[PDB]
Write a protein that binds this DNA or RNA. Structure first.
Lengths: 122, 130, 48, 198, 32
RNA sequence: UCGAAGGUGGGAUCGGCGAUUGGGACGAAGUCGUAACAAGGUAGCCGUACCGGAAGGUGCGGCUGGAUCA
RNA sequence: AUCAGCUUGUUGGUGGGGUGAUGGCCUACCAAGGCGACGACGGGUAGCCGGCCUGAGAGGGUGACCGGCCACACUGGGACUGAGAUACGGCCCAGACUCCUACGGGAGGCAGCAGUGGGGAAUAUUGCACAAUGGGCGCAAGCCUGAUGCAGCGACGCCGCGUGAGGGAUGACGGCCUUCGGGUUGUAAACCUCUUUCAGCACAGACGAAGCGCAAGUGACGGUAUGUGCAGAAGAAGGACCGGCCAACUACGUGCCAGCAGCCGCGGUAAUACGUAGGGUCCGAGCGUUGUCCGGAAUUACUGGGCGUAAAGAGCUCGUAGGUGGUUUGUCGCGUUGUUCGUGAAAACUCACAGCUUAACUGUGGGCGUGCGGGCGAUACGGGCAGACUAGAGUACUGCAGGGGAGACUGGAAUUCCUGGUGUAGCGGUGGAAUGCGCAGAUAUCAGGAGGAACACCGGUGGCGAAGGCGGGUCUCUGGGCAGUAACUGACGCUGAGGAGCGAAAGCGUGGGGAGCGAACAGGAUUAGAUACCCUGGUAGUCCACGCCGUAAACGGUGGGUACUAGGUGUGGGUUUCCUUGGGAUCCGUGCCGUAGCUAACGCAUUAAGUACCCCGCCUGGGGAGUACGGCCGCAAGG
């Protein structure tokens, strides 16, 4: 607007808007899991979601969601947390890899098959 | 009063939009050259220069068609003070695919886009009319 | 595309003190004559 | 628009002349609250046209979908619109505006293909163009981009018309490449036309 | 426009004013 | 003479933790009222001051994004 | 700039010194500057580039391989040697660490190639050769070379090839649906011929070497590549997805569960959206996920956006830097432009061609290298200089209108109290009442007195002021506007980041004043309950003097300037032509209606939100929040 006003100062982009604060710009981080409690979502979607809060190696304290039917992980398992997005429980935006370092792949999973980590039938 | 030629072409867009027969202007050299170009391309019909309060004046009659329809389908000042747009010879910007014309004031005077192309000189634009 | 007017406070060397404030002096690039005195002026045009 | 494939032993399906190209752009059920509930109706934005470059724009209101489509066909039938071209291209870059609909319609060299979004792609695929280059800036809609595209095609004019407005002998109105494209397109009009006579 | 925007803004403003009533003293002394 | 490290000194500045405390976001469903939307039952809103468990109430000036029409 | 001042070898001079060379590089004296809102000094991050990725381009991201520069070599100083030094595998010192020691003292330095531990989501062998190319020393032979040449390892990437071909039914077995007819898998399979790349086993076996060598030999890769043979369909397919976008649907199983999901959203016993099955679709030695970037995003809009009500016009002016500039003659050639020279290494990129069975790949020749510097040319436009002009701007002169402002003096009606009459039981108040004032003489009425504040009527869609704002009168001092003439000056204009000034009400300080009204504060009433409305009382305040504060729906919700674009009708100020106050024409003002044009719509519409130019402010989803932190101003409230 009034191009000398842009010669003075103007027209810069807004903000990087970083999605995940896992850290480092790293795709997945292994982590020590603690207190694997099960929660209640928002009002149109009522169920019990199986989350676990994980202390990423990156020293931060986050809370990840465990996809699949059940979780092999108990207290102090070395779960490999990737970044995802679950709308349904507020503040949980990370998903634990199933078929990983500690948490075994989902058993009798026969159709989804890459997610949930089920190895092929012999 | 900050731009002379913007008031010129502005007065041609208003007098063209409001179905006028003629228009009156403060005469100057650059407006005389632009009036001579728009004579030579036929966007206006003819202009005459009067003597008036103090200075001379430019009375342009506008060229209409087979009914009330207009020949100048627009003006747009591009080499405006504050962002005076310069043009090398590679491209005298083509206007409306070539159907419109570009009043370009090179070192040889004032030319159109086509004359700036063939004679091999560029160095300005001014407003371009279609 | 705005044709910006910019200034440049160079430093320059008069042996004879021929110039004063407000003048139209010439310049020419030299050897580095001190810490940022890299210009000497010949044929001063107009005095004030 | 379902269950159209049918064979009838009745009087006639009344298939006849004017086998034009007809495109249905969008259908959104339009609701109206009245005392005790909602009354659903239907809007079909109907594009019709022939491959010369005559375009219609129809806007059908009915509480059935093929009824609204047929009323859009009859309304664009009532209201056609001539589009000037060069070969199968467009003449010169324009911008059309229907109150928020911005569409830039720019020509291109042949072979490139109609590159436009779905509303402008509909209005230009019904028309006589095969190779132009458009874009729909603003308003993110179907009705305003169709109507803005038709206003953009109203800002078109012939090279000859421009020459006529300025009282100048062509050559003197166009530049030369576009006159050569006039020679190419009229030459293939002569070839396919004289192959049409035999 | 609507007065709803105006009133949300004003709710914030009110709450803040109250918060400075009650902490007035405390801010003076904790600051001094 | 210069001089790296070391020592003493008082500061700048960037953070981490801190009992307690302020507010903020979300939760369903709880308690208390019903402030706003219809003249929302005292037209609403802005500034400011004072007061009140809370929404708020009042004053002073303003405003129609106010109403019916004495 | 939530970092505004920093600097004393710091800025310049002279004499020395030092250096390969100029020089506060150094030193003694003398002078006292220098650098900064074109962001100095500080803070944060970062090797820079040819390039790479993305994109229509403009631009955005990035700096891996390959290539060019720079900086460093355990951390931090220092010199020496030398043509040349951050001296990685040199020296000296001080540290931190590892190790040897007979305790006196020594030794180390993978950010060379391998390799180990650690950290980590994650990144390879303690390989073979100097045959080729580069490098060193040597007369040469030759010797050295973890540069390089190659090999190993990982679908880590890009490209190519394979897992067969042809025949084959009114379409078998099996599977799952079904309307119980059948339908799909499916020409697919079994079978019947045929062909074998690539893996397999044989035998032959390179080019890279117009090389080196005076020796007779010499290829690390290598018995590899590649040939010619033999046997036989023979050893060779998987992953995602099938509500919508978005190519692809049916059944069974659980029925707000278990789960899904990129967003919209699917699960509450008939889910094409969850799990399994058939089937389909899309890719294919891969296919999905996560992360990071560009794109779509015209969603920071130079190209290419906006600001009446959607986010967005500073409360209003004056003015510093800045940006911008009417008419016209000359000159300069700084912007602009034309042309030629030089340069923009190679590679990449693009076009053509050649080479490898093709391709990726590699090479040759153009173009690209959007730029910069030198020479020569042009002078319309911008600018500089030197001039000229009167239309913008300002001044003089003649009038004219006005709640423009400040100071001073004064006027009456009304309310309240006071003294005194006249005079009695109620007055006041309300939707209805009661607290309340009365019966000690109230309210009522008459006379007089005090005191304060506000100015009925004129007076309204009206005047003036930049905006707040301004109405009893008179006087004194002072500001602006408008018109007319054109007498003067001669572009002195416009806007204006920061900056100073003015700025309702409330509030604040000190000192006065205090009738009416009146927050807070009481009582009464209403009510479930009123911390409320309504009633009775009532302090700060409202008033004046002197200062603060700086806020408002400070609103035309519309920054300032300028030119133009159909009209119609009111009213305010002033000039003139005509009828002779009426009408016209004109300049300035303020309203209502209305075309064109504009707008998302309502609306605006010569007083633009229309058509254009100049400068400023400001906006970038909603909350969080005009809040924290920090600073500035303020007596505080707070801004």
């Amino acid at each position: 607007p009034t191009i000398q006003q842009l010669v003075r100062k103007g027209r810069r982009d807004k903000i990087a808007k970083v999605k995940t604060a896992a850290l480092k710009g790293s795709p997945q981080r292994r982590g020590v899991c603690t207190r694997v409690y099960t929660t209640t979502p928002k009002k149109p979607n009522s169920a019990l979601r199986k989350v676990a809060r994980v202390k990423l190696t990156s020293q931060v304290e986050v809370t990840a969601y465990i996809p699949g039917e059940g979780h092999n992980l108990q207290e102090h398992s070395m779960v490999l947390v990737r970044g995802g997005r679950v709308k349904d429980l507020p503040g949980v935006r990370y998903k634990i890899i199933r078929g990983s370092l500690d948490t075994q792949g989902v058993k009798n999973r026969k159709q989804a098959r890459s997610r949930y980590g089920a190895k092929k039938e012999k | 009063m900050t731009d002379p030629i913007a008031d010129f072409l502005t007065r041609l867009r208003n007098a063209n939009s409001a179905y006028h027969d003629e228009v009156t202007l403060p005469h100057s050299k650059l407006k005389a050259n632009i009036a001579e170009i728009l004579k030579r391309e036929g966007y206006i019909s003819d202009y005459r220069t009067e003597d008036a309060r103090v200075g001379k004046s430019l009375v342009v009659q506008l060229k209409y068609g087979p009914s009330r329809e207009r020949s100048i389908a627009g003006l747009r000042r591009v080499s405006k003070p504050g962002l005076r747009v310069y043009a090398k010879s590679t491209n005298l910007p083509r206007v409306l695919g070539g159907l419109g014309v570009a009043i370009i004031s090179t070192s040889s005077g004032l030319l159109t886009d086509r004359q700036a192309a063939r004679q091999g000189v560029g160095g300005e634009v001014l407003a371009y009319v279609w | 595309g705005k044709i910006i007017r910019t200034t440049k406070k160079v430093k320059a060397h008069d042996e004879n003190g021929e110039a004063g404030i407000g003048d139209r002096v010439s310049l020419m690039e030299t050897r580095p004559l001190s810490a940022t005195k890299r210009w000497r002026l010949v044929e001063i045009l107009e005095k004030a | 628009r379902g269950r159209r494939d049918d064979r009838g032993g009745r009087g006639r399906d009344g298939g006849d002349k004017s086998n034009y190209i007809e495109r249905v752009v969008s259908i959104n059920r339009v609701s109206k609250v009245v005392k005790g509930g909602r009354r659903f109706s239907f809007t079909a934005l109907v594009i019709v046209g022939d491959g010369k470059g005559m375009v219609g724009v129809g806007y059908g209101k009915a509480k059935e979908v093929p009824a609204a489509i047929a009323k859009g066909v009859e309304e664009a039938r009532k209201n056609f619109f001539r589009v000037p071209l060069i070969g199968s291209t467009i003449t010169h870059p324009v911008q059309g505006e229907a109150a928020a609909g911005v569409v830039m319609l720019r020509p291109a060299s042949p072979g490139t293909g109609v590159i436009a979004g779905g509303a402008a792609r509909a209005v230009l695929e019904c028309a006589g163009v095969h190779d132009i280059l458009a874009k729909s800036l603003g308003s993110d809609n179907a009705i305003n981009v169709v109507h803005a595209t038709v206003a953009a095609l109203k800002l078109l004019q012939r090279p000859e018309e421009v020459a006529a407005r300025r009282g100048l002998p062509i050559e003197d109105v166009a530049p030369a490449g576009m006159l050569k494209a006039r020679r190419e397109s009229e030459a293939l009009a002569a070839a396919a036309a004289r192959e049409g006579s035999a | 426009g609507s007065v709803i925007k105006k009133r949300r803004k004003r709710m914030s403003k009110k709450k803040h004013r109250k918060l400075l009533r009650r902490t007035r003293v405390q801010r003076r002394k904790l600051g001094k």
